[PDB]
Amino acid sequence: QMVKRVHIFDWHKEHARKIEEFAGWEMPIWYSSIKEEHLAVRNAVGIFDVSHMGEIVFRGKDALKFLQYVTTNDISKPPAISGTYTLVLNERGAIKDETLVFNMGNNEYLMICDSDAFEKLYAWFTYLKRTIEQFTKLDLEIELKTYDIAMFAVQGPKARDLAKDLFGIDINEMWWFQARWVELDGIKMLLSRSGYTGENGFEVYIEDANPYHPDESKRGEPEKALHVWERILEEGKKYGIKPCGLGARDTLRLEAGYTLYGNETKELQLLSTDIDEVTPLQANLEFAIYWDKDFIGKDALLKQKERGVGRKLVHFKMIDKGIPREGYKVYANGEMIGEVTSGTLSPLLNVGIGIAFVKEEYAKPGIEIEVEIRGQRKKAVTVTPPFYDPKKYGLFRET
Template sequence: REYVILAIQGPKSRDLLRKIIDVDIENMPLFGCDYAKVSGVDSIVSRTGYTGELGFELQITPPENAKKVFHDILDVGKEFNIKPIGLGARDTLRLEKCFLLAGNEFEGGRTPLEAGLSWAINWDHDFIGKDALLKQKEKGNYERLTCLECIDKGIPRHGYVVEKNGKIVGRVSSGNISPCLNKGIALAYVKPEYREVGSILEISVRDKKIRAKVVKPPFVSKDWAKENS
């Protein structure tokens, strides 16, 4: 079956959705889901998203029914100042919250330990790659995903080199301008001895080097919108 997915995200997403849905979403837990009619259209609603904000995703089938729901969301959402956005805007949101992206932060050449996903490993059983991970964990000298907040103007991008005193110490996996912070931010795989919070590194952006500071994740807290509204 084919589905269209519409994501309603943000602090007021629940207030908006309750106006057009026929099930109770007040106490829906994170990652919870239910069958529902949204604007009279059969849907699966889940409390999920890729923005780090309160949000819901609607899975609609057949796809042609999604057009009505989309326009109803925009009409009802006028009082909440809703705006339609695309993948580019969503990507800046997930980056501000340090959400990982397949193909960038984790791919065939990276391990869960390097990506900061050790919490997802169940060590109490055998699995493919366990011995290699145990050896890597024991050595502890592997590159790890690191948050870099730019001091100088510039936009870090995937693949850009991270340096310290002219020495390559890492590489950017995801980077962009943060609309909330109004500065460049990046996730980068960096050698362990250069990851201390507060350390100043350099990112090679085209023909210049810009300074960036190692910071704690996330770049933008989940309460940022409320605190800055």
Template structure:
């Protein structure tokens, strides 16, 4: 796993993320409908642009985090987490009223998704396509061909590196995988698993649903105020609760920490401040590139500032750590 992690940071890593869910929302009311369900402002998207967002429930908790792709004014693609695809599909359908002029389609079985990530990703992928990859800005996408296979090519990822996510018919997955591995063989590309994807996203302080995000966690608490557009025209679900929470001041915040004594924090471990239990670790791991033991935890807002000393209960022993700024890792542009 460490070798896979380091390959992605320094060269390129290839990830099969075909387990992700894809849901089409099409029709004249597509933008208004998705804007009602999500925190970010879909009305601000241009054709060919994507953004990160959340579904929120009536209490302001996160139903799921997702990507929204705008193919046109009446055509949006929602890419959701694998474990929550059915939950999300039910949530979306439950808010589809007879007055909405749109069609919904769960197309999760219609796509494979292969992510090529790392500083060499563009150089490798351009060997397989006539699409101008350099012309695709971060969080933009286009439709083209990769190794002759029709595909959606998106400049997105979940590693903290530059890279692309390629969506295509599932029966083309092996062809695309082999083509990318061959194209990257001279550049040191490695096939990577979900364990490496997890440590990469943690170094980049990217939230994972079920850890930093959940039905009882507000996006504001998880540091996602930047995608929670309380000022947008659309009245999205949970907006009133989130606005009230912001007005009152957050009681807890997600904070990054690094261990200052030997020990690895894991999700579920208790956090202590001044001898009192103060929070819980949501994710923790050695960070292969940074060569530190790091983690994320929800802490009382007044203790969530860099420099705050904390203790992590690791198998009955309180081990020292300190709150640090996030992301832990940020690539050089």
């Protein structure tokens, strides 16, 4: 399998202290340190290259109805140009991926999905489209744009001032998930107010040549993407900006409490049952479901409500030392209640924090539990995210 590399991979290879395979992409894990980058986002501003995230575009008079049946939320709600968080479920209710769909206007929709799931999603949607086309003509085009679009995330309490310096816009006047077309030094790009850190911020989407594009005929110097990257670091210097790798991306999202597909959410294609896992009901993502419409996997969710979800996600923080990690067994009163799905050392708290999938009766805050780390039972307690004080950190901190 070909290794996946983002447009400005060379810049990362030259500046990152650690480059390693992530979702098949050779990505920068950190440049200075995970702690410094994490705190830069919490205290100032940081920029992440997330060009590895998937981008799938749907165009045509039949795009809306198609997206309405294959995803869980009301795709007709967001006005152009803005998005909505929506899940893509399989035939028995499990999550194929968590996504963000933007209504770009003119019957065009842009879906941002996970780097570890975009190939599956593209095949999914493409074969669903071809299945329909065996019986009727459709006005629907589905194009994979992951390798064509460079995407950067600028996050932190200073991201707003930085965006003002760069584009002359105030992201605070935009609602979350709203987007708009902007330009920087002659370079056109889409800008959305969004993020994966818990802080205020924005993300830009740039169409540019990728020297590592799978399609040899589409390869070229990432002149535009690199220019924007360097310009943001330039204008961000006055704010103490730092380039941030995937290490801090994970510590920041965990502190905020966000799920990560492949860890908290996934599809197991379980044998011998009419309800697959993990479903939105087991991951506390029911808010992403518009129940008054039909969609793939809906029947299984209705059945799951009648029987009980069995297991649910729960956030927890360590009391003793040890960093919880995926797979570690979790106990309560001596009885095994589940396993850790994500874990890491919080740069803010300076104690391990994580998420676990446990018997649903334990998915509540304030419960004393134990996590087995390398043969040792380490104490922890369940909590309600975020892990930080929302009055001090995060986009809603007091001013």
